Every structure is written in C-alpha cells, then in structure tokens.
Design a protein around this ligand. Structure first.
Ligand SMILES: *C(=O)[C@H](CCCC)CC(=O)O
Ligand SMILES: [Zn+2]
Lengths: 262, 8
C-alpha cells in the first residue's frame, strides 16, 4: 500500500536511497550485461577488468570512450529528478537524503542530486596509473586519438592506438597513463566509501531500493544492516514478487517513484 | 576489500 509508505515518508528524517541499473536503463543507458548487451564482439565482463586493460588499453578505452559519448544524448529520467528535488526540498526542512548508487553515468549529478556516493566510480573521472590522482573529466573526446572512435558495430576495425597517445596524466613530471575511475571485475570497493555508507545507513530511518533489489549485490551488503534495526525498506523495480508476499512497487521507476516522493 | 559482484 502506497499511503502506508507515505506515512513513513512523512516521518522520516534521514533517508537513504540505493540505486541500481534499472534507473540508468530507463534513461536509455546500456549496461552491456546479458541478452543483446554486446559491444562489438564483447560484453562488459570481457573488457571491464585490469587484465583486459593491461593487455589492450586501446580497446578498453575505445569501449569506455563510447560510453562517455553516448551520455551526451541520454538524460536523467523522472526518477532521477524526483529524487534530486526531494533531497533539496527535505534539506530545506533539515531532513537528509543520500544516494548510494552502483551506476557510473553521473545521471544523479545531472539531475541535481548532491549527497551521492558512487561506489563503482564514474565514467567521467580518471585515475593515473602512475600517480593515482583522480580528476574529473568530461572532455569530448577525452583525447584527440580517440576522436570518432569506439564505434559499437560488431565489425568495426580496432583503433589500435599507441599507449603514449591514450589519455595521459597532466602533472608534467608524471605523464602516466590514465584509466577510467571505475571499479572493474576483480577489484575491491574503496573502503573509505564503504565506511561512509555504513555510517549513513546506520543513521537512516527509511531506505529505498531503486532499479535493483535488496536480495542482490550490492543492495545486499547493506539492507541487512538497516532492516535488522527495524527500519522500513521500499523497493521500486520491475521484478515480480509471489502471490503470498518492507514494500514493493513493481513498475518503471520513472512512473512509480515521483508520486511516491511528492 | 569487497569484490564487486562478490567476485561471482
Ligand atoms: C562493474 O560492473 C562495472 C561498472 C558498475 C556497473 C554499472 C563494469 C562497467 O560497466 O565498467
Ligand atoms: Zn599522474
């Protein structure tokens, strides 16, 4: 029942909202996972690893360049906005709202969300392989060598860009090769971030799960913590639940969520 | 540190 949810919403003084790929999907962002989510020959599993990058950093950058470029035409959907505006409205009332997102497309940022935790990093940050510096970067194209590259056609010719011309660190002494500041398969999360999120989820008195479910990674690292304190948890996603069954609102976050937060 | 997807 929705009214039942809103009664909590009304009381809640510290809301945490966990967001997953469902919400980026509704803005038309490809996840590259499972059926028909190929990029050329490969899927994300294949390319989003340190080995792939060591082996073929031109190819990996072609991939990530493409992903950066397709964001120029995907906009935040109503879910993104309804969140950001909710954060704003409630902050004015001294009530907090934080986003913990598994998405790396900066859509929440572009919606106007402020207190956001990007646990898998972001397509629009780099990390220097040599000095470890983390810079924002939105340059299209990120470097000239990649201009007009990274086409997704299965049959596209590899650009086979020499490493020295891929994105490099600007600190003159360094010039290290840059990598996307995104968490790849086989890498750990930043524990500083996890420790902050832990703190936020301990504080919270209502938790929302959006475009993913509490049973699955990464919602599952946490909801146990919040739920075991007796805090309500509301999911908004497209999965069913059985006849005989913490609230669930089946359907597109674009539709379900804004009424919920108005 | 936590493996993403739990490494699965
Ligand atoms: C891990 O899955 C990683 C980013 C987090 C999923 C949005 C893979 C990738 O897309 O680079
Ligand atoms: Zn550097």
């Amino acid at each position: 029942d929705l009214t039942a949810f809103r009664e909590h919403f009304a009381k809640a003084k510290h809301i945490a909202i966990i967001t997953g790929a469902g919400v980026s999907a509704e803005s038309g962002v490809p996840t590259f996972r499972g059926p028909g989510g190929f990029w050329r020959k490969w899927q994300a599993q294949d390319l989003a690893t340190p080995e792939a990058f060591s082996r073929d950093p031109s190819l990996v950058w072609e991939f990530y360049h493409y992903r950066r470029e397709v964001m120029r035409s995907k906009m935040p959907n109503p879910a993104h906005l309804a969140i950001a505006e909710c954060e704003a409205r409630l902050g004015q009332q001294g009530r907090s709202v934080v986003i913990i997102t598994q998405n790396i497309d900066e859509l929440h940022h572009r919606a106007g969300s402020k207190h956001v935790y990007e646990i898998h990093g972001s397509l629009f940050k780099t990390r220097c392989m040599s000095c470890g510096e983390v810079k924002a970067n939105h340059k299209s194209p990120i470097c000239p060598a990649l201009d007009g590259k990274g086409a997704p056609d299965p049959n596209t010719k590899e650009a086979r860009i020499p490493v020295e011309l891929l994105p490099r660190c600007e600190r003159k002494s360094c010039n290290g090769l840059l990598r996307p500041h995104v968490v790849w398969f086989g890498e750990t999360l930043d524990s500083d971030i996890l420790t902050a999120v832990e703190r936020e989820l301990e504080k919270c008195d209502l938790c929302l799960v959006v475009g993913t479910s509490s049973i699955v990674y990464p919602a599952a690292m946490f909801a146990p913590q919040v739920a075991s304190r007796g805090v309500p948890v509301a999911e908004f996603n497209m999965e069913c639940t059985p006849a005989t069954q913490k609230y669930h609102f089946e359907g597109p976050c674009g539709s379900t969520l804004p009424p919920a937060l108005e | 540190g936590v493996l993403k997807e739990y490494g699965v």
